[PDB]
Amino acid sequence: MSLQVGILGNTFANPFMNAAGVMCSTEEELAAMTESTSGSLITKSCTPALREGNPAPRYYTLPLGSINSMGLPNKGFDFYLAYSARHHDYSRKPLFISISGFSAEENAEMCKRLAPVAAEKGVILELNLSQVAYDFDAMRRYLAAISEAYPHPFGVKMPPYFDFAHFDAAAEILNQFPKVQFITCINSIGNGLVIDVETESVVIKPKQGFGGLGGRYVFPTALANVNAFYRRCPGKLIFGCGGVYTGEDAFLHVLAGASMVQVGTALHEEGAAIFERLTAELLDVMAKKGYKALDEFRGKVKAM
Amino acid sequence: MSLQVGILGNTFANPFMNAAGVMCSTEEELAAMTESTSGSLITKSCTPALREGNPAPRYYTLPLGSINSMGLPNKGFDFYLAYSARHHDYSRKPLFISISGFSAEENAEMCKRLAPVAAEKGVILELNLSQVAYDFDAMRRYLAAISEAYPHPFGVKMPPYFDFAHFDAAAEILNQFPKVQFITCINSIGNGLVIDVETESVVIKPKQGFGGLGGRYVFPTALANVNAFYRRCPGKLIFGCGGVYTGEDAFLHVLAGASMVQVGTALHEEGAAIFERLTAELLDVMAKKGYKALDEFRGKVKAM
Ligand SMILES: Cc1cc2nc3c(=O)[nH]c(=O)nc-3n(C[C@H](O)[C@H](O)[C@H](O)COP(=O)(O)O)c2cc1C
Numbered sequence A, B: 001m002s003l004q005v006g007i008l009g010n011t012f013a014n015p016f017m018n019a020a021g022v023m024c025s026t027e028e029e030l031a032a033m034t035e036s037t038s039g040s041l042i043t044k045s046c047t048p049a050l051r052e053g054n055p056a057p058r059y060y061t062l063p064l065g066s067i068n069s070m071g072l073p074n075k076g077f078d079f080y081l082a083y084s085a086r087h088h089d090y091s092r093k094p095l096f097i098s099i100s101g102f103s104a105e106e107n108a109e110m111c112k113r114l115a116p117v118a119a120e121k122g123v124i125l126e127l128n129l130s131q132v133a134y135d136f137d138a139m140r141r142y143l144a145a146i147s148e149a150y151p152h153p154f155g156v157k158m159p160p161y162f163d164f165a166h167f168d169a170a171a172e173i174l175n176q177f178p179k180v181q182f183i184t185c186i187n188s189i190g191n192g193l194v195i196d197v198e199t200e201s202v203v204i205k206p207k208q209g210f211g212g213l214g215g216r217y218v219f220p221t222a223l224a225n226v227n228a229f230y231r232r233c234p235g236k237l238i239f240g241c242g243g244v245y246t247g248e249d250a251f252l253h254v255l256a257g258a259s260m261v262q263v264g265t266a267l268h269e270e271g272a273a274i275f276e277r278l279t280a281e282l283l284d285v286m287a288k289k290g291y292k293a294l295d296e297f298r299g300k301v302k303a304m
């Protein structure tokens, strides 16, 4: 039995990693993720320069998940590039860098600088399109600019879509770009609103309390997007993100088509130790079913 | 203390009703909803002719809600018109009729026939725009077609939106039609997917297991849409629909700005007695807080 995943020219010890933005902003956080049993790790979505982030409170723990309006707090692209350049131990695990510039041009500039580092160190780009991916002509324009600026393959982080026409429309643009080697589904379900009964107030300060939803709320939506893009993008990898708490949630993600599985809200709560539990629980499900490798049921969700 | 709602020229004993589609397809179900302590009720969304719907199973109970792809099974417009005209006891509570024709014309034709029944009996139309409302010119077209065809005010059932550009776009269109007197937020979060761990297969037969999500999954999305339209459409009523299982849930919908509160998945699981529990629970929250009427906190959600 193995949880290994052989993709992007790398051997990942297991399918698990953090979700971009969770436990990956500071130098100490990246080291904790490297030290952990996760198969990989991704940096916090960075901007060309340092950003303080939205006003606190900007994250709130719900019984069924989370709601947040962080506003891309990050130490700046320079910092994560340098972490990628000469601070990360590639001997432990492969590394993903999330970039999220406010324009096609900002991104393109970061990629031009990332390229030598990626070519030498092997760090992998995940472009956060989550908003751009909700405008299919903006999306094509981003992707064309990046593919012109960036010689290496990369991935894209997508917002959830909620109908087959959008799935088709997005997949069609993605399939025109060979360099996009993976698609991560999903970013938060956007602009939910949480209110406290006692205080009768929203629970986060920015955007009049409207924020991104994660956790148990988003699990069926994440599965749907993973499977929808798995079907429509046979030439790409799909990374699952959303609603993962147990090895069984992981199993379902993989069943729907996920190659890698990102953990957000659960990791935020349980900490880097969760990955040791997640691998054991996944191995458990597989043992109960006689599975020896993820390649044996990835994307093999059945009709009834 | 009172839960009365005075809207649309009617007095409602309380803000609770069923969601369209739940416990409202047969005479028996409609009788049960009328006999219940609900403030109102609404018929199954109907088509000009009877529909048998999608193949079974097309509904499945989730840990935190439901998934379904019913496919609009309904007894046909003639049936619900007859119920509205001849069978419903209006001295018991007001009645809503849901229509969901497949084209603008189908909807226009039904509205032409509903119009005299609405004038004499007082049944109130909810037009199901949920995908049509995800296309703003098609929405504009429908609304204009219906406003031409139908002399009375009506409401519209909306799908969820997930960003402020869409809230602004929809609001702008809705506010251009004075006959649109209420807006129901929300229909199902579209096209989620759930997979059983044991069978490794989807849990509903249609559309490869993709279906609309209901219940606790949709609640923060529901509140967000209720409040977003409450703010942008001050001339209209907002009806809340999504994730109501308790009186506190209803309290939050009202705090977000809901005038009526619709109950779907929870009603499906519990049955019509749920309305006496929901009223008692909502009265309990108001009592702890010293509220005597819903107007004292409707739409009064606080920012930080
Ligand atoms: C506090 C917080 C910060 C996040 N920051 C980012 C980010 O910088 N870039 C990004 O693509 N997603 C970000 N996300 C979204 C996650 O990467 C992921 O898409 C989502 O949380 C999946 O939900 P899950 O918590 O159920 O795993 C953030 C989420 C949270 C809760």
Ligand SMILES: Cc1cc2nc3c(=O)[nH]c(=O)nc-3n(C[C@H](O)[C@H](O)[C@H](O)COP(=O)(O)O)c2cc1C
Residues within 6 Å of the ligand: B019, B020, B021, B022, B044, B045, B059, B066, B067, B068, B070, B072, B098, B128, B157, B186, B187, B188, B213, B214, B215, B216, B218, B241, B242, B243, B244, B262, B263, B264, B265, B266
């Ligand atoms: C089995 C089922 C049938 C439904 N049928 C309709 C329908 O015919 N028309 C409609 O507008 N919404 C329909 N809905 C959606 C509900 O009206 C409601 O929008 C949704 O379930 C969210 O509310 P909830 O969380 O309380 O279930 C249906 C939902 C379910 C679960």
